[PDB]
């Protein structure tokens, strides 16, 4: 506990393509790069020679492969994958010194799922069984890991932003070299997604003053498998209005705020100072107690290489708040499953300037925080 040198820097990727970890599957071990995804619950790997794929799982080569004789069909908002369920032996080379028998969905057909030019061949769904396909009886990888080994029921993520990105997934613990200051914990409201409650939103310390239920309509989640900070429609328009007001030193086309246009500045002359900070107050551990996380334009204006051009990476949502890479790149994030809570601390690797840094601050007095959660 406290130091996991072998797991530091075990994540790689490209901007906009996500963060992957090296895994092995089968006997003998077949090496695959696997997207780290806290917003889903399936371990699903390429099993057929799709042209975008560097590598794929070849079940015929594995002596420890067991066919579950069951299909799985996963349409989602932005694509589709389908596969054949099985089990096999799985290890993480730059993770704990263990081997686990895990459920594997062998992907046999997909659409808009694999990224052309990416270096990953599968997805590690790190959320809970309730959202696993086809149903909650398919035990997620991390559940299998904890059940079969002495690995503590905790993992933590340091996602380091920017073409190449990196970071750390500490499996079974916390590495104190990855953050500065203190960890502040928010309750996991329900174990399906990593669902949290946002109690207050500020743009440059100016409260949006919305009914806090709007912030979590219909949920708020922490998702390493999403790029943007996604906000419910009503919250998004309030936030953009305020961000526009604060940044009115320079005028931008309306399309930029909708992510339909890039904005460019002469190399290394990006006016970070004109753009406001964004604070999300999260439900704390104690009644009437909250803390806030604060991100910079360096997090929400993402570099696009095609002199210095940027995409606005805050976007409107109909699925509730999604705290994607935009949020997570500011913070060391502790998924403390054992204690049903998520910890946030200022990341040792977050992108900032000489004037401002990302911040995790508390405690604050916030009443009626339970009222902020949405119920069907
Ligand atoms: C499995 C799923 C998913 C995610 C991605 N992610 C990415 O490509 C990506 C790109 N850049 C990032 O940061 C910047 F570097 C982060 N991630 C790609 C394909 C996918 F199918 N995970 C989700 N959380 S959202 C939809 C989907 C999903 C979720 C739930 C149920 C089914 C499918």
Swiss-Prot record:
Positions annotated with a glycan in the UniProt record: 97, 116, 288
UniProt activity-regulation remark: Inhibited by RTN3 and RTN4.
Single Gene Ontology MF annotation: beta-aspartyl-peptidase activity
Regions of this protein lying in the Extracellular compartment: 1-376
An individual GO BP term: detection of mechanical stimulus involved in sensory perception of pain
Cellular localization per UniProt: Cell membrane; Golgi apparatus, trans-Golgi network; Endoplasmic reticulum; Endosome
Gene Ontology cellular component list: axon; cell surface; dendrite; early endosome; endoplasmic reticulum lumen; endosome; endosome membrane; Golgi apparatus
Active site: 37, 223
Enzyme class, broadest EC rank: hydrolase
Keywords: Acetylation, Aspartyl protease, Cell membrane, Cell projection, Cytoplasmic vesicle, Disulfide bond, Endoplasmic reticulum, Endosome, Glycoprotein, Golgi apparatus, Hydrolase, Isopeptide bond, Lipoprotein, Lysosome, Membrane, Palmitate, Phosphoprotein, Protease, Signal, Transmembrane, Transmembrane helix, Ubl conjugation, Zymogen
Disulfide bond is among the record's keywords: yes
Keyword Cell membrane (UniProt): yes
Membrane topology: Single-pass type I membrane protein
Disulphide bonds in the chain: 160-349, 212-372, 264-309
Residues annotated as domain Peptidase A1: 19-345
Main subcellular localisation: membrane
Induction description: Up-regulated by the Ca(2+)-regulated transcription factor NFATC4.
Subunit relationships: Monomer. Interacts with RTN1; RTN2; RTN3 and RTN4; the interaction leads to inhibition of amyloid precursor protein processing. Interacts with SNX6. Interacts with PCSK9. Interacts with NAT8 and NAT8B. Interacts with BIN1. Interacts (via extracellular domain) with ADAM10 (via extracellular domain). Interacts with SORL1; this interaction may affect binding with APP and hence reduce APP cleavage. Interacts with NRDC AND NRG1.
Family classification: Belongs to the peptidase A1 family.
Main function: Responsible for the proteolytic processing of the amyloid precursor protein (APP). Cleaves at the N-terminus of the A-beta peptide sequence, between residues 671 and 672 of APP, leads to the generation and extracellular release of beta-cleaved soluble APP, and a corresponding cell-associated C-terminal fragment which is later released by gamma-secretase. Cleaves CHL1.
The protein's name in its UniProt record: Beta-secretase 1
Organism per entry: Homo sapiens (Human)
Lineage, uppermost ranks: Eukaryota, Metazoa, Chordata, Craniata, Vertebrata
GN (gene name): BACE1
Residues of the full protein shown: 57 to 447 of 501
């Amino acid at each position: 506990r406290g130091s996991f040198v072998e797991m530091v820097d075990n994540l790689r990727g490209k901007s906009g393509q996500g963060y992957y970890v090296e895994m092995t599957v089968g006997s003998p071990p077949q090496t695959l790069n696997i997207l780290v995804d806290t917003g889903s619950s399936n371990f699903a790997v390429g099993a057929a020679p799709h042209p975008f794929l560097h590598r794929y799982y070849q079940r015929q080569l594995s002596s420890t492969y067991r066919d579950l004789r069951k299909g799985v069909y996963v349409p989602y908002t932005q694509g589709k994958w389908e596969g054949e369920l099985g089990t096999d032996l799985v290890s993480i080379p730059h993770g704990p010194n263990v081997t686990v028998r895990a459920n594997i969905a062998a992907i046999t057909e997909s659409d808009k799922f694999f990224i052309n030019g990416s270096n990953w061949e599968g997805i590690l769904g790190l959320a809970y069984a309730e959202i696993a396909r086809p149903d909650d009886s398919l035990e997620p990888f991390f559940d299998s890991l904890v059940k079969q080994t002495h690995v503590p029921n905790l993992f933590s993520l340091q996602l380091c932003g920017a073409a190449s990105v990196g970071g750390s997934m500490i499996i079974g613990g916390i590495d104190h070299s990855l953050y500065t200051g203190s960890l502040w914990y928010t309750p996991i409201r329900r174990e399906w997604y990593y669902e949290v409650i946002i109690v207050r939103v500020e743009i440059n310390g100016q409260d949006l003053k919305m009914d806090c239920k709007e912030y979590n309509y219909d949920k708020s989640i922490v998702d390493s498998g999403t790029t943007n900070l996604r906000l419910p429609k009503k919250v998004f328009e309030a936030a953009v209005k305020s961000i526009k007001a604060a940044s009115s030193t320079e005028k931008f086309p309306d399309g930029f705020w909708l992510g339909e246009q890039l904005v460019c500045w002469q190399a290394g002359t990006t006016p970070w100072n004109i753009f406001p900070v964004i604070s999300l107050y999260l439900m704390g551990e104690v009644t009437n107690q909250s803390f806030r996380i604060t991100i910079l334009p360096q997090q929400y204006l993402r570099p696009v290489e095609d002199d210095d051009c940027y995409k606005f990476a805050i976007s409107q949502s109909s699925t509730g708040t999604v705290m994607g890479a935009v949020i997570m790149e500011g913070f060391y994030v502790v998924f403390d499953r054992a204690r049903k809570r998520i910890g946030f601390a200022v990341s040792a690797c977050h992108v900032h300037d000489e004037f401002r840094t990302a911040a995790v601050e508390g405690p604050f007095v916030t009443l009626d925080m339970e009222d902020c959660g949405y119920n069907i």
